[PDB]
Structure 1
Amino acid sequence: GSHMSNISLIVGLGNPGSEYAQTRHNAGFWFVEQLADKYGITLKNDPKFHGISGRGNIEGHDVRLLLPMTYMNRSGQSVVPFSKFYQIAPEAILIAHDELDMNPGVIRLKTGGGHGGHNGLRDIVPHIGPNFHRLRIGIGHPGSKERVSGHVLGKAPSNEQSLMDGAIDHALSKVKLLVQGQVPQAMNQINAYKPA
């Protein structure tokens, strides 16, 4: 299984299909797909766990990557059995996700807390509890609750996309600290990111 707070499972939240791939609610997929490319981790079909998953070495540590293919609001139907099967405790899990409550170009590492209204996290916390780490990728808020769907399921304008892409790239550079268990240092260095 996992060991301490070395991160050994990195989950990206999102929806399956080309129609959702460029939407804000797929920010977690963007991070994990980019991470997989950086480290040469193959993301392959994983029907048993309703996802796409991979396993490989990040900086000398055996790490698994997971993209649920459940649709966002059923993400726990992938994350929970996967983490349980591989005996990965929440403390060794990082979940990357879009964050309505932060600006595009803001990114933060958080440990614990609730779902903040996020429908993917809402499907995960009841089962494994809150004590996993989160890479909160700011996407902004559309105003009202009524608008949250056409917002998260929208394709950001280019300036916002650039801001998010730069923040994601910064976070990729800090995964080495996370897989090494250096959560405090990673939190400081991720949270300090500015776009300009």
Structure 2
Amino acid sequence: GSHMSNISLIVGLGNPGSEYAQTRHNAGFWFVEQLADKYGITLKNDPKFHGISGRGNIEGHDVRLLLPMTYMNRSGQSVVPFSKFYQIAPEAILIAHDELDMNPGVIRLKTGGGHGGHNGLRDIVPHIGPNFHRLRIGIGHPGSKERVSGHVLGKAPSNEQSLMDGAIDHALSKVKLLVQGQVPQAMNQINAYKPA
């Protein structure tokens, strides 16, 4: 199983299919796919857990990666059985997701709290509780509450995309801290990111 707050499961939230791959609500997928390429972790079909998953070494730690393939609002249907099966406590889980309440190019590591309206997180917290860590990848907020679907299911303009891609790249460089259990330091160094 997991051990303390050494992160050993990294989840990226998103929707399946080419039509959603470039949309803001897939920010978490972007992070996890880039992380998997950095470390040479294979993301393979995981029908048992309704997702795509992998396992490999990050900086001398055995870490599992998970992308739910359930659609966003059913993400717990992947995350919860997967973490239970592998005996991974919430304290050892990092979930990367788009965050409407932060600007493109802002990224923060948060431990605990609610879903903040995110319909993927909403499907996870009831089951495992709130005490997992989150990589909140800012995507900006649209005009109104009416506009949220259209904003999260939209493809960001190039400037915003560049801002997010930079922030994601920064976070990748801090995963070593996380898998080593250095959550405080990771929190300080992730949250201090600026794009320019």
Q: TM-score surpassing 0.5?
A: yes
Deviations 1:125-163 (A, max 9, x none): 000000000000000000211100010000000000000
Q: CA deviation at 1:21?
A: 0.1
State how far apart, in whole Å, the 2-side matches of 1:119 and 1:109 are. 19
Cα distance in 1 for partners of 2:144, 2:126 equals 26
Distance in 2 between the 1:128 and 1:146 partners?
30
- Using the alignment, how far apart are the partners of 1:125 and 1:38 within structure 2? 29
**1:32-58 residue CA offsets vs partner (Å, 9 max, x unmatched):** 000000000000000000000000000
Q: SS where residue 15 of structure 1 aligns?
A: coil
- 1:195 Cα deviation from its structure 2 partner: 0.1
Alpha-carbon distance in structure 1 between the residues aligned to 2:150 and 2:127: 28
Taking structure 2 as the reference length, the TM-score comes to 1.00
> In the TM superposition, what is the alpha-carbon distance from 1:67 to its structure 2 partner?
0.0
Q: Deviations over 1:78-107 (max 9, x none)?
A: 000000000000000000000000000000
Please provide the CA RMSD for this pair: 0.2
Identity of matched residues, %: 100
Structure 2: stretches of 5+ with no match in the other structure: none
Instruction: List runs of 5+ in structure 1 lacking aligned partners.
Output: none
Match of 2:119 in 1: 119
Tell me by how many angstroms 1:70 deviates. Answer: 0.1
In the TM superposition, what whole-angstrom CA distance separates every residue of 1:3-49 from its partner, at most 9, and x where no partner exists?
A: 00000000000000000000000000000000000000000000000
User: Structure 1 CA distance, aligned partners of 2:87 and 2:145?
Assistant: 37
Partner of 1:48: 48
Q: In 1, Cα distance between the equivalents of 2:136 and 2:181?
A: 18
User: CA offset at residue 171 of structure 1?
Assistant: 0.0
Q: Distance in 1 between matches of 2:13 and 2:143?
A: 22
How many residue pairs get aligned? The number is: 196
1:165 CA displacement: 0.1
**Structure 1, residues 148-185: CA drift from partner, whole Å, max 9, x if none?**
00100000000000000000000000000000000000
Secondary structure at 1:131's aligned position in 2?
A: coil
Per-residue deviation, 1:73: 0.1
Instruction: Say if 2:95 is the partner of 1:95.
Output: yes
